[PDB]
Amino acid sequence: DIVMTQSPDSLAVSLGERATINCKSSQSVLYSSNSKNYLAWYQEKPGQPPKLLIYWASTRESGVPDRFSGSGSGTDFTLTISSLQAEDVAVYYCQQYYSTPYSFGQGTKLEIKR
Amino acid sequence: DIVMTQSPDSLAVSLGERATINCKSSQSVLYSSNSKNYLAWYQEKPGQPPKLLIYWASTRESGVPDRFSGSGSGTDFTLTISSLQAEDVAVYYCQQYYSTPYSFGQGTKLEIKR
Ligand SMILES: [Zn+2]
Ligand SMILES: [Zn+2]
């Protein structure tokens, strides 16, 4: 059973500043056979379903802005936004697709400090 | 706690024929306030992370082929592929994003009968 835990639960930074959200999996999601991390990051904008941002722990999905980047390996991971944009207000989720059933973290609410 | 159950676990149809996969949530994922179903369908092609196909139970994501369509409401849902294409070989997952932590079904493997 893999449980995903995020930290913090919510945070706020001024526009243009960096934001950092962490995620921890109960078990390792690094597959030894291919040395890849089965971890993903989702962005859930207000009233919208979560959409894929990063997969394989650090591979950015197409169309996704350059300011988003994932890092980490094993059990500790980090989603970083280099420079916060207004449209980034959302709840960010981390997911392990290492073993079924695929599980999500409980989300970290990102807001901008006005 | 919401558990997603899929049926069958794997199936195969000849190219060009219809394929049907079912999903059932342990609790209702229909939100009374807006009358929307917080259900999604993901396609996981061989060695790739699951990608979003359908959300809001029947809304197709952009770029997704017209042959894919989701239906159902409440607890019973269905993913239908009108005419099976060769590139559709994959494991299909249904997800509830009604309540955290968002959960996935265990997947239904789709293959083509040669
Ligand atoms: Zn600051
Ligand atoms: Zn047939």
Curated annotation (Swiss-Prot), chains A, B:
Keywords in alphabetical order? Adaptive immunity, Cell membrane, Disulfide bond, Immunity, Immunoglobulin, Immunoglobulin domain, Membrane, Secreted, Signal
Q: Which GO terms describe its biological process?
A: adaptive immune response; immune response
Region spans: Framework-2? 41-55
- Quick check: keyword Disulfide bond in the entry? yes
MF terms (GO), sorted A to Z: antigen binding
Name the domain of life: Eukaryota
Q: Where is this region: Complementarity-determining-1?
A: 24-40
Q: Where is this region: Complementarity-determining-2?
A: 56-62
Specify where the region named Framework-3 lies, as residue ranges: 63-94
Segments forming domain Ig-like? 1-101
Q: Where is this region: Framework-1?
A: 1-23
Pull one GO CC term from this UniProt entry: extracellular region
Disulfides per UniProt: C23-C94
State the residue spans of region: Complementarity-determining-3.
95-101
List where in the cell it is found: Secreted; Cell membrane
Relate the assembly described in the record: Immunoglobulins are composed of two identical heavy chains and two identical light chains; disulfide-linked.
Its biological purpose is as follows: V segment of the variable domain of immunoglobulins light chain that participates in the antigen recognition. Immunoglobulins, also known as antibodies, are membrane-bound or secreted glycoproteins produced by B lymphocytes. In the recognition phase of humoral immunity, the membrane-bound immunoglobulins serve as receptors which, upon binding of a specific antigen, trigger the clonal expansion and differentiation of B lymphocytes into immunoglobulins-secreting plasma cells.
The name under which this protein is listed is Immunoglobulin kappa variable 4-1
Q: Which organism is it from?
A: Homo sapiens (Human)
Q: Which gene encodes it?
A: IGKV4-1
Which portion of the complete protein is shown here?
21 to 121 of 121
